[PDB]
Design a protein around this ligand. Structure first.
Ligand code: NA
Length: 161
């Protein structure tokens, strides 16, 4: 029944808590929301530099959650590294999109990826049809019952095949 679920870990962690803080529980909270409904195939994507320790230079909370979810075969780090002077991160976005697209699943994010809509035509289609936004109120992950709006489908149908 249930469509595969690809979450954008950075979109979510940033949303949750302080907007200027990578809040890892946001990620957990999202994952459980899908775990409670019965979903078993969930990928969260997050860049690999988010493991390093510490980045007292980038604010973050409950970092230990990231490896916990990697262990449960849900979180997957995206590649990154330090080239010459600074840093180089393989867009999280392409992994998130590709995966969902190639698994005919859904993407949990409030990013619409207007660049990736623009690059490939087929992807623009997919995002319009299968992005799933949300709001957080404190620790409460609240996705809409009307994900495409009055005219599209009910949330339960959105998560089915
Ligand atoms: Na945050």
């Amino acid at each position: 029944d249930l469509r595969p679920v690809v979450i954008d870990g950075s979109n979510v962690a940033m949303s949750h808590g302080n907007k200027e803080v990578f809040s890892c529980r946001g990620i957990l909270l999202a994952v459980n929301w899908f775990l409670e409904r019965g979903h078993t195939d969930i990928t969260v994507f997050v860049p690999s530099w988010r493991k390093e320790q510490p980045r007292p230079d980038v604010p973050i909370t409950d970092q230990h959650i990231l490896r916990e979810l990697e262990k449960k075969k849900i979180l997957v780090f995206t590649p990154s590294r330090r080239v010459g002077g600074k840093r180089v991160v393989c867009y999280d976005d392409r992994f998130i999109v590709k995966l969902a697209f190639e698994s005919d699943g859904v993407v949990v994010s409030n990013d619409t990826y207007r660049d990736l809509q623009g690059e490939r035509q087929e992807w623009k289609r997919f995002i319009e049809e299968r992005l799933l936004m949300y709001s957080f109120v404190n620790d409460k992950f609240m996705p809409p019952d009307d994900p495409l709006g009055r005219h599209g489908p009910s949330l339960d149908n959105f998560l089915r095949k």
